[PDB]
Amino acid sequence: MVSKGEELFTGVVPILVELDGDVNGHKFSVSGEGEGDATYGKLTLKFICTTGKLPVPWPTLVTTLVQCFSRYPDHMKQHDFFKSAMPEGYVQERTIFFKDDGNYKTRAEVKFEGDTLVNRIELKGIDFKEDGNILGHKLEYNYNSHNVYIMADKQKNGIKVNFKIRHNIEDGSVQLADHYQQNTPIGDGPVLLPDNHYLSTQSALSKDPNEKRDHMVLLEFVTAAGITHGMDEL
């Protein structure tokens, strides 16, 4: 099946992202805009720190800063929770544990506001080392590919999601960030609850050569996989 929510994503959709953050007491705000094309699992966005210098590395914020733009193949469209919750949207909550360092806890609402898919987030970070990889800005400005593992939480009418991000460091080491996530629908309508599957996620970071503010340009491609081939023909 294809959910009614998925019909909202068959063309190019404008995206807005607003994040209000506080990490070890360093307050900051990020705004982003761009567009997604879930037909190709593609996002293209530019984010700006509107409060000055970002007090954490940009790569640490990529997962917090719209999984409804993932491409689900045909035999797996009945497993797309994220589009099925649209346009009313969903609440996405995480705790992200940076190995040997602090944690982010985030709560976001992802939903349509008019024609635009908007992700509004609050983030709180604590327990960071002032000279660790994060507040000491030792992460390279790049990003790896990851698998985002998804399972249904039928009790909560949503999903539980987990994965481990690898952030590359200049000296050849890696800073690991373990992500524990759950998503729940905002509205009343039925949502699709999936079988166990994963998203294969790729992200590339760049800069706008005419932008003086602290910023990140991001390109992402995300495709779902891993459903056995249960629903062989369906």
Side-chain angles (χ1 to χ4, degrees):
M1 65 165 295
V2 175
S3 75
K4 284 305 184 37
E6 174 168 349
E7 302 288 351
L8 302 163
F9 290 87
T10 61
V12 172
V13 180
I15 295 169
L16 173 55
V17 178
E18 294 294 347
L19 169 62
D20 267 343
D22 178 329
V23 175
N24 273 38
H26 301 287
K27 303 186 149 176
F28 61 102
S29 291
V30 171
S31 299
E33 72 190 3
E35 63 193 23
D37 200 354
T39 305
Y40 314 106
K42 178 172 58 89
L43 292 178
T44 311
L45 291 159
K46 179 174 154 183
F47 301 89
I48 297 292
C49 183
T50 57
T51 41
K53 184 138 73 159
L54 195 73
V56 297
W58 282 107
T60 74
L61 292 181
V62 166
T63 49
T64 292
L65 297 170
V66 294
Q67 290 177 313
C68 44
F69 286 101
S70 304
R71 179 163 65 91
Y72 279 70
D74 287 3
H75 80 283
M76 290 183 61
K77 288 179 183 302
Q78 10 73 275
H79 301 292
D80 186 352
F81 165 91
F82 302 108
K83 297 182 186 61
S84 80
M86 299 297 163
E88 300 76 12
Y90 52 78
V91 174
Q92 177 158 299
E93 297 166 284
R94 298 210 178 92
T95 303
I96 304 167
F97 297 97
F98 294 87
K99 165 96 104 104
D100 299 318
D101 214 327
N103 62 87
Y104 295 163
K105 283 177 190 175
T106 65
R107 180 178 179 290
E109 286 187 22
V110 184
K111 68 185 164 277
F112 274 88
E113 304 181 4
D115 292 343
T116 304
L117 190 284
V118 182
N119 184 13
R120 293 183 185 285
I121 309 130
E122 300 221 305
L123 180 152
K124 173 77 159 164
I126 64 162
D127 304 330
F128 287 89
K129 299 180 196 153
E130 278 290 351
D131 56 1
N133 289 327
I134 290 83
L135 291 180
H137 287 265
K138 307 176 177 175
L139 298 190
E140 295 184 53
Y141 189 73
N142 57 40
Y143 220 88
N144 291 306
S145 273
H146 302 93
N147 292 337
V148 170
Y149 293 99
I150 296 178
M151 61 173 197
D153 181 354
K154 294 198 223 286
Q155 214 75 56
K156 282 198 215 166
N157 203 35
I159 62 173
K160 283 128 111 220
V161 177
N162 69 97
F163 51 94
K164 181 196 303 298
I165 290 298
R166 291 173 63 82
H167 294 300
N168 289 2
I169 305 174
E170 16 148 70
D171 65 8
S173 59
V174 171
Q175 166 66 65
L176 298 174
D178 282 337
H179 279 63
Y180 293 90
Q181 168 184 340
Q182 66 182 22
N183 297 62
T184 65
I186 286 168
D188 272 332
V191 296
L192 298 173
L193 295 173
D195 292 351
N196 289 19
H197 64 289
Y198 67 94
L199 306 178
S200 166
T201 306
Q202 293 181 88
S203 307
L205 310 192
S206 61
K207 292 294 182 186
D208 165 1
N210 298 312
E211 179 59 67
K212 285 177 186 148
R213 287 172 293 180
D214 198 2
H215 73 283
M216 166 174 70
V217 174
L218 168 66
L219 226 174
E220 190 142 284
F221 292 109
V222 186
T223 296
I227 254 131
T228 139
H229 204 320
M231 336 94 56
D232 90 82
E233 131 116 63
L234 267 147

